[PDB]
Design a protein around this ligand. Structure first.
Ligand SMILES: [Mg+2]
Ligand SMILES: [Mg+2]
Ligand SMILES: [Mg+2]
Ligand SMILES: [Mg+2]
Lengths: 143, 95, 48, 114
RNA sequence: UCGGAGUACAAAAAACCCUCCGAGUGAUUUUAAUCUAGACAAACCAGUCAAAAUAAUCACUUAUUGAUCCAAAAU
């Protein structure tokens, strides 16, 4: 027929991003005497230092995929008073922007019972939502 | 068990085995689980489920139940609508 | 004190629950339970 | 002579608590790993915790044991305080079980060429 | 009969008219569902966990329980 006709039975998809994006990948369902729950593809992590606000996105491998920190000269020069709720909104939607560019629309966030009531975090989550990024990771298919 | 009867000289059957058990033609015997109608409000949903189920008996038992049953219950049976008829044959058994 | 076995009746159909109750009667028995037939969440009423 | 020994009911069977699978054992999804009355070993990656504190394997794999840092759930108060009063240099450690997945997650088969 | 320690020091098991403590239920609220992989345990009978698929807690917590048959009941 054609010299290109041949295909072969089992297809290799070599990129690590694939199965996750298909939702058919693995999470680690487990731990559960410990905290936080380690079941996720992507975990939003927010570290509040007495000085700087830092926001990361992590893979269960520990790798830091996309981050927005204040000590970054970009956000540093554009605004005032790092510890402000305003600066948290800012880091929030900067990480939103950078997340869409990285094409990850889904991550999980596990704040602390006391943390979840503070303004900085509510505004982090609002910045995230308006950014278009969905928290509460989609379920696994045939778990 | 009566090994030779009075009037016919045949071998009698124990009817109390015929009321609680079921013989498939493979030779597996099939029985209810003890205490399934008994004191339900005490037990967990889990235990209730475990109790409603039918189960299979080990070799020692099937063997014993066979000695208490005549040829007539070891017979091949085709019933109209027979639920268990799909279960009477053994498949893919490599011993 | 004693423990009373009570039989709850669903609003709809033949669904019947069986459960235990307290002599002193801390909390009178009225439930929100699961009916199999309509596959629903129901109000179950304490009966005998 | 009155021989009354005042003690009663020493007798119970043992519960066979202990470790069912050993490090480097192959496991199928659903096998109980170990069963304990108090937490001796905690569930790690791909190990589920039963309401009676059983540890069962979630994936198909190889069972591994590990010493890891222990960060109690902020909802569980006792452990929170135990973590609180420690001197400022020390962290807590525990033993965990893990399953290391063997089978790949799936395969892409060519069904039809149209 | 049933469960915690010891005896039985670190996988399991393990005796006595051995040494010591317990249970033949309370207190709530949130009414804690179906169906099925794989398992622990186990002479047998009974006991235990539990993914996927559909739509109980506190009281050391572990023990709070009785098989057939036969009876009464309603579904
Ligand atoms: Mg009664
Ligand atoms: Mg003992
Ligand atoms: Mg003993
Ligand atoms: Mg499920």
């Amino acid at each position: 027929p054609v010299e290109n006709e041949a295909v072969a039975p089992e297809f290799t998809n070599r990129n690590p991003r694939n199965l996750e994006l298909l939702a058919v990948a693995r999470k680690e369902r487990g731990w559960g005497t410990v905290w936080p729950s380690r079941e996720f593809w992507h975990r939003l992590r927010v570290i509040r230092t007495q000085h700087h606000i830092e926001a990361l996105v992590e893979h269960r491998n520990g790798q830091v995929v996309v981050s927005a920190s204040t000590r970054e000269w970009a956000i540093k020069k554009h605004l005032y008073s790092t510890r402000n709720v305003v600066a948290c909104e800012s880091v929030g939607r900067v990480l939103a922007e950078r997340c869409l560019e990285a094409g990850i629309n889904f991550m999980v966030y596990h704040p602390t019972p006391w943390e979840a009531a503070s303004d900085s975090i509510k505004r982090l989550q609002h910045a995230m939502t308006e950014g278009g990024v969905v928290l509460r990771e989609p379920r696994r298919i045939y778990e | 068990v009566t090994y030779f009867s009075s009037r016919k000289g045949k071998r009698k059957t124990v009817k109390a085995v015929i009321y609680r058990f079921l013989r498939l033609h493979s030779g597996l015997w099939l029985r209810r689980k003890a205490g399934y109608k008994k004191k339900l409000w005490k037990k967990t949903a889990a235990r209730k489920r475990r109790l409603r189920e039918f189960v299979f008996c080990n070799k020692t038992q099937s063997k014993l139940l066979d000695k208490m049953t005549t040829s007539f219950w070891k017979r091949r049976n085709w019933y109209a609508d027979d639920p268990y008829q799909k279960y009477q044959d053994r498949t893919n058994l490599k011993v | 004190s004693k423990t009373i076995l009570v039989k709850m009746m669903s609003q709809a159909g033949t669904g019947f629950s069986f459960n235990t109750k307290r002599s002193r009667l801390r909390e009178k028995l009225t439930l929100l339970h699961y009916d199999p037939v309509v596959k629903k969440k129901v109000l179950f009423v304490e009966q005998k | 002579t009155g021989g009354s020994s005042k003690n009663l009911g020493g007798k119970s069977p043992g519960k066979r608590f202990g470790i069912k699978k050993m490090e480097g054992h192959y496991v199928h999804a659903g096998n109980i790993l170990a069963t304990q009355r108090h937490f001796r070993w905690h569930p790690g990656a791909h190990v589920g915790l039963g309401k009676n504190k059983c540890l069962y394997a979630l994936e198909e794999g190889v069972v591994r044991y590990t010493k890891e840092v222990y960060v109690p759930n902020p909802s569980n108060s006792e452990a929170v305080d135990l973590v609180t009063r420690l001197p400022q240099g020390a962290v807590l450690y525990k033993t965990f079980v893990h399953v290391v997945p063997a089978k790949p997650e799936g395969t892409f088969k060519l069904v039809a060429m149209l």
